[PDB]
Design a protein around this ligand. Structure first.
Ligand SMILES: CCCCCCCCCCCCCCCCCC(=O)OC[C@H](COP(=O)(O)OCCN)OC(=O)CCCCCCCCCCCCC
Ligand SMILES: CCCCCCCCCCCCCCCCCC(=O)OC[C@H](COP(=O)(O)OCCN)OC(=O)CCCCCCCCCCCCC
Ligand SMILES: CC(C)CCC[C@@H](C)[C@H]1CC[C@H]2[C@@H]3CC=C4C[C@@H](O)CC[C@]4(C)[C@H]3CC[C@]12C
Ligand SMILES: CC(C)CCC[C@@H](C)[C@H]1CC[C@H]2[C@@H]3CC=C4C[C@@H](O)CC[C@]4(C)[C@H]3CC[C@]12C
Lengths: 393, 393
C-alpha cells in the first residue's frame, strides 16, 4: 500500500479543501460587492479549477486500473520501481486546490493593506508553474521530470516517435483546451485591459472589453492548437508505419475539428461586422457540428473502446471479454458518451453574449468528466486487444 | 497497524479542526460585540475544551507506551483482541472537537432565526453525553461500554475491589476537576441567572452574578469530590491488604487536599462578609498550600515514578533500568513536575476578582498537561517494578 503519513496528508488536505470551499460559497453570497462584473475573475480561476478537477479524476482512474488488473505500468512504459499510486495524485490535487481556494478568498476579502488585489492570480499561476520546474530533487522530482521531458515530445509534434504516452497526453489535451483559452485571456486582459493604477482592477468599474471575442484569429488559433498536435502525430505515424487505413482516417477527424472552428469564427466575425452575407455561414457550421460530432463519436465506440463487435456473444454490443466487474457500466458509458459528446463541440464553436458564458463555464467540467470515462475503457481495450498498434506482441 | 480509512478520518478531522480554529480566532477578533461580558461563555466552553485536549494527549500516551514496550494491555487487564490504538483516540478527539468549534462559532454568529443562542451549549453537552450512552452497538460500543461499567466502580468508591483501572481513572479525575466546576457552573447559571425571555442570554447585558463565588458549601464540595474518591479507595485497599504503610500514608495526602480547600473557603467567606478575624485564616491556608504541594510532589518522584533511588548507579537520581530511549526526558519531567505542581494547587484554592480568572483559564491546560507526563512514567514504573501492589508475580 502506502505509508501511513501519505494517507494522513490526503485526508488533511481534503478536509481543509472542504472547509475552505464552504467558506468561499458563504463569502461569495454575503461579502460580495454586487456592483461590478465578476467574469474577468471567473475565467482566470476557471482555468485552474479545471486543472485541479482533472488531477483528482486521474487519481480515481489509477485506482480503477489497478483494481481491475489493467497493467498501466507496461502500457505507458513506466518504471516498475517507483510510480505514483492513487494516493500520490489525491495529494497533489488537494495541495494545489488549497492555494486555489486561498487565492480566490483573498480576491474577495482583500485582507491586506495597499498591495493590489490583482496580484493573487499571478501569484497562484506562478507558484503552479514553479512547483513543476523546480530543479531541486524534492516534492516528486522523478514524476515531474518524467512529465516535463514528455510535454516536450508532444508540443514539437512531428520530430519524435509516437509512443503510447505521447498519444495519451496529446489526446488528453483535446478535452483540456479551456485551460489554454483562459491562459490566453489572462494575458490579453493583464496586458491591455486591466488598469494598474486602480487598486481593484480585477473587478472593473462597469456592469466594453476586447479579449473574449473571436478576435482577429487569435482566440481560434489557440482553440485548436490540441487538434493540430494530434493531426501531425497521426500523419507521422502514417509516414512511419505505411499502414494507411487507421492513421489517415484518424487524422481525418481532427481535420473536421479544424473546419467547425473556422466556420464559426467566420460567421461570428461577419455578423459582428454586420455583413449581409452572414447567414450562409450559419448553415455550413451546423453541417460541421453535425459531421464532426458524429465522426468523433462513431470512433470512440467502434475503434477507441471497441464495443459494437460482431462476435460479442451474450454481451449484447460489447466485447467478447470484459474486465470491469459489472455490466451496467458499459451501458451508462455508452449513453453518456453521446449526450456529453454532442455538447462538447457546441462549447468549442460557441466560446453570442453574456448568456453564452454561463453555458461554457457549466459545460467545462463536463468535458473533463467525459475524458475521465474515456480513460477507463481506452486503457482496457488497449490492454486486451492491443488496438493502439504500439506493441509488437 | 490500522486500516487506511482510519488514518484518512484522523487527517480529515484534524484539518477541519485547524481551519475552524483559525476561523474562530478571526471571528472573535472581528465579529465580536465588545460590549458584554464573555466569561459566562468562556467557562461553559472551557470545560469541553479541557475534555478534548485530554482525549488527544491520551492518544499520544498510548503511542509512547507501545513504542517503548510498556505492555499497557496487561496492566489495565484489557482484552488482547480489540483495543483502541492511538489512531482511534486521535479520531474521537477530533470528532468531538469539531462540534465544539461549530457550537462556539454559532454562539458568535448566531446565523439562524428566532431560535435562541443559549441552546448551543445545551446541544453540545447533550450530544457529548448521548455519544457515550448509545445502546445501539455502533461507534465503538465495546470501548464505551468498558468505560461506562468502570465509571460506576469509581463513583461508588468503597463497595468494589480496587484494580489498576479504577485507581488510574480515579487519579486521572484529580487533574480534571475543572470539568466538574464548569459543569456545576452551567447548571447554576442556566437555573437562576440566565433570563430565558431575552434572545441573547449567554452574553448578559452588563460589563452581578451569583454562581462562580466560593458559595454556601457547594463550589468547594464539588471542587474536591475527586479527592474523596481516592481517599476512600486507599482506605478500602488498607482494609483489605492490612499493609498499613503505603495505603494509609497515601490517603494522608488527599487528606491534606481536603484542608487547603476548606481553609481557603473559610477565609474567602470571612472576608467577603468583612469580618475582623479574617486574616488569621490566610496564614493557615498558606501553610496547607506549602504542606500539600510538597506532600503530593515528594510522592510523585519517590513513590509514583520511583526516581530518586539509592542503587541507581550511573543514572544519577534515576532507576537502575530505564525504558524510554533518551535520558534528558527524565530530567525535563523532574524539573516540570515541580514548576507545574506548585501552580496546580494555587488554582485549586484560587479557582479574588476578574484578574483571578485569566489565571485559572490559563493554568487549566497546564494541569491536564502535567498528568499527560505523569502517565508516561507511572505506567513504566508499574511495568518494571510492580510498585502499584496490584499483581502477584
Ligand atoms: C492558467 C492555468 C494554467 C495552469 C498551469 C499549470 C501547469 C502544470 C501544473 C500541474 C502539476 C502537475 C504535477 C505533476 C503531476 C505528475 C504526474 C505524473 O507524471 O505521474 C504520472 C504517473 C506516472 O508517473 P511516475 O512518476 O510514477 O513515473 C516515475 C518513473 N519515471 O502515471 C500517470 O497516470 C500519468 C498521469 C500524468 C498526469 C498528467 C498531468 C498533465 C498536466 C499537465 C498539462 C498542463 C497543460 C495545461
Ligand atoms: C461540561 C463538560 C462535560 C463533558 C461530559 C462528557 C462525558 C464523556 C464524553 C467522553 C467521550 C469519551 C469516549 C470514550 C472513550 C473510550 C476510550 C476507552 O475506553 O478506551 C480506552 C482504552 C481501552 O479501551 P478498549 O475498548 O480497547 O477496551 C476493549 C475491550 N473491552 O485504553 C486506554 O488507555 C484508556 C483510555 C480511557 C479514556 C478515558 C476517558 C475518560 C473520560 C471520561 C471522564 C468524564 C468525566 C468528566
Ligand atoms: C447516465 C450517466 C450520467 C451515468 C454516469 C456514468 C458514470 C457515473 C459511470 C460510467 C462509467 C463508470 C465507471 C466505469 C468503471 C469503473 C471501474 C470500477 O472498478 C469502479 C467503478 C467505475 C469507477 C465506474 C464509476 C461509475 C461510472 C463513472
Ligand atoms: C522544561 C519543560 C517545560 C519541558 C517540557 C517537558 C516535556 C515537553 C517532555 C517531558 C516528558 C517528555 C516525554 C517523555 C517520553 C516520551 C516517550 C517517547 O517515546 C516519545 C517522547 C516523549 C513523548 C516525551 C515528549 C517530551 C516530553 C513531553
Amino acid at each position: 500500500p502506502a505509508p501511513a503519513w501519505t494517507t494522513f496528508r490526503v485526508g488533511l488536505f481534503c478536509g481543509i479543501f472542504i472547509v475552505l470551499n464552504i467558506t468561499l460559497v458563504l463569502a461569495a453570497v454575503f461579502k460580495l460587492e454586487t456592483d461590478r462584473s465578476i467574469w474577468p475573475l471567473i475565467r482566470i480561476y476557471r482555468g485552474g479549477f479545471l486543472l485541479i478537477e482533472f488531477l483528482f479524476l486521474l487519481g480515481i482512474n489509477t485506482y480503477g486500473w489497478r483494481q481491475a488488473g489493467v497493467n498501466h505500468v507496461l502500457i505507458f512504459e513506466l518504471n516498475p520501481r517507483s510510480n505514483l499510486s492513487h494516493q500520490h495524485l489525491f495529494e497533489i490535487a488537494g495541495f494545489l486546490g488549497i492555494l486555489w481556494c486561498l487565492s480566490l478568498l483573498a480576491c474577495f476579502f482583500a485582507p491586506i493593506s495597499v498591495i493590489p488585489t490583482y496580484v493573487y492570480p499571478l501569484a497562484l499561476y506562478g507558484f503552479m508553474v514553479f512547483f513543476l520546474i523546480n530543479p531541486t530533487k524534492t516534492f516528486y522530482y522523478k514524476s515531474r521530470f518524467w512529465l516535463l521531458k514528455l510535454l516536450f515530445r508532444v508540443f514539437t509534434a512531428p520530430f519524435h516517435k509516437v509512443g503510447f504516452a505521447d498519444f495519451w497526453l496529446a489526446d488528453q489535451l483535446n478535452s483540456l483546451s479551456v485551460i489554454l483559452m483562459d491562459l490566453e485571456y489572462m494575458i490579453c486582459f493583464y496586458s491591455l485591459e486591466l488598469k494598474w493604477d486602480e487598486s481593484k482592477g480585477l473587478l472593473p468599474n462597469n456592469s466594453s472589453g476586447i479579449c473574449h471575442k473571436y478576435t482577429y484569429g487569435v482566440r481560434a488559433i489557440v482553440q485548436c492548437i490540441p487538434a493540430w498536435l494530434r493531426f501531425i502525430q497521426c500523419l507521422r505515424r502514417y509516414r512511419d508505419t505505411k499502414r494507411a487505413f487507421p492513421h489517415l482516417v484518424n487524422a481525418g477527424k481532427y481535420s473536421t475539428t479544424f473546419f467547425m472552428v473556422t466556420f464559426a469564427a467566420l460567421y461570428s466575425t461577419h455578423k459582428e461586422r454586420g455583413h449581409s452575407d452572414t447567414m450562409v455561414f450559419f448553415y455550413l457550421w451546423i453541417v460541421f457540428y453535425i459531421i464532426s460530432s458524429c465522426y468523433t463519436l462513431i470512433w470512440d465506440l467502434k475503434m477507441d473502446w471497441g464495443l459494437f463487435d460482431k462476435n460479442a456473444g451474450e454481451n449484447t454490443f460489447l466485447r467478447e471479454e470484459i474486465v470491469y466487474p459489472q455490466k451496467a457500466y458499459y451501458y451508462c458509458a455508452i449513453i453518456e458518451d453521446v449526450i456529453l459528446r454532442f455538447a462538447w463541440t457546441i462549447q468549442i464553436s460557441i466560446t453570442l453574449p453574456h448568456s453564452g458564458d454561463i453555458i461554457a463555464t457549466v459545460f467545462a467540467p463536463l468535458e473533463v468528466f467525459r475524458r475521465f470515462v474515456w480513460n477507463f475503457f481506452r486503457l482496457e481495450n488497449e490492454h486486451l486487444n492491443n488496438c493502439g498498434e504500439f506493441r509488437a506482441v
